[PDB]
Design a protein around this ligand. Sequence first.
Ligand SMILES: O=c1ccn([C@@H]2O[C@H](COP(=O)(O)OP(=O)(O)O)[C@@H](O)[C@H]2O)c(=O)[nH]1
Length: 620
Amino acid sequence: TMENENKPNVANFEAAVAAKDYEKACSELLLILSQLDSNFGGIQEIEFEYPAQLQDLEQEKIVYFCTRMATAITTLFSDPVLEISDLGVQRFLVYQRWLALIFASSPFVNADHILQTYNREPNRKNSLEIHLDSSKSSLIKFCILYLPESNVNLNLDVMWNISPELCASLCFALQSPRFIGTSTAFNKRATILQWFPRHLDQLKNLNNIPSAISHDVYMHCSYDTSVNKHDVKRALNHVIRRHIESEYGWKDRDVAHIGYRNNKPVMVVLLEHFHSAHSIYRTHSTSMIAAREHFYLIGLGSPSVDQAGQEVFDEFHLVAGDNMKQKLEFIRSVCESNGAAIFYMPSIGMDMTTIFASNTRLAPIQAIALGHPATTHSDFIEYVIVEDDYVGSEECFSETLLRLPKDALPYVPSALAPEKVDYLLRENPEVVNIGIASTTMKLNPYFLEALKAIRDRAKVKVHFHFALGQSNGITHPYVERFIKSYLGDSATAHPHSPYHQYLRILHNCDMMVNPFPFGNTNGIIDMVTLGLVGVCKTGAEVHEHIDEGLFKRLGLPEWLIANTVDEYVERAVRLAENHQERLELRRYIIENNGLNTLFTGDPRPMGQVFLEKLNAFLKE
Ligand SMILES: O=c1ccn([C@@H]2O[C@H](COP(=O)(O)OP(=O)(O)O)[C@@H](O)[C@H]2O)c(=O)[nH]1
């Protein structure tokens, strides 16, 4: 060992590339990509120097970073001699999304200029097709640099014949970014969603694909617009099921007998991201608290859960184990010694543990809620807790929906909610400012085309303020370019901001519009809090339908809830042109709104319902 061997360092990566030491370059580069991973795209704790002019100019400092990184990556991967260790390949595909961002936030856009150096057939006959030598090594390198923004052609069928596993690693990488919003990237991912599932279903386990981003593959499909977007989850479940049987020798429990604690049957709840300042606790703690009239509750989670989270349950334990095989054995053992009636996950999708767990048989009733609002397509999960007013069509879900009364999941209000108001109802707007509260995953070309439509068509000048949740570090310059490609001067791409500052941006707006197809929830509450009204578009999936449910609970009029893009655009424009209508409605909403009603209700049903379903299991 040497001191400072493992510090991500842009100058040391560059020097290793100039010195043609391909091994040190790779490893120095992987250190940087790994850090970008940990930092969620931020560049803190990566060492680099910059021209003084950039000191206070952070976006410009980030673009400078990505530019240095893309030039050094270009030299390195353009060199015909470079050969990547097969360990190395697996790491590069796992970090692909970070290279994607390196290039997309630089002026290069993508790494096609590297790709073109790999062409061998001076014919072409389409210069967007790249004909490689037959070296396995060249196929690899191509894949690593086949970015979501790539313009080069890709034929998946031929690909998957040559190497199934390489090709499934690509599909993973290309599904894993938290921003897939441009036309080029989105279209690519859409293709994968139709093509990849039936191919992944043929896979045997997780050994030679990038498994550390399966949770990302699992969640991100929800942000596409197709009806059958979740098919990849069904496939992914089978491979995980095969994995845990084959690599772990997993055995399901005998769930014919249940045990008892303080004379009640046992609900074991496996938790993801359940801190009391966060939305899972805000939406699901009270229903879990009330479930204690009928069940003893055991909470399994991470040390990230705070005292208020732990107090929801009768008993709380850390999920122990050094790997997945162990954590599962641990979870199994808790269910065994207690003899679980219920296995429940309020959220599934954010951590890989919950995903694995949902492919096992641990209790006779196994059920989830929609903290991540999408069907599991797992045959091991029977029920889905959901508020009746949030369901669109029941056929979006493979599981049976347990539709609970619309006041059955009262929310815990945020401690950050301002106590005082200051409504700004602008009588004279030259400009209509229209806010949009969003994460990067919610952004897409259909949403942004709808927004360009509202801008082009409205007879009033409009300005769009995007308050982008978690837009950040090297992701952000790329997002701003995407937004500007549609709206130019009619839009401001605000990066992630603290709560009071985020509230200040919206407070300067006249109305809001909601993203589709995956809408807001918390955005809507902040909207009404500020006395604002907006448009949302509804649809069949819960994540499309929530906004409708929520608009009705809060007392917003149905004309605000559009069924199609063309209506969405239409109502948005109407809200923007019709000043006095818009203001009357703001005044109506300031005056009488169900904000109150979100925080109260009867949380008992969930427990009640699990009891009946359990009692009926105990007769048979
Ligand atoms: O710049 C921002 C953007 C968002 N948020 C907070 O994060 C929430 C949005 O989170 P998300 O879209 O992931 O889930 P949602 O709660 O909308 O269902 C908002 O309510 C804000 O309270 C914030 O503080 N600053």
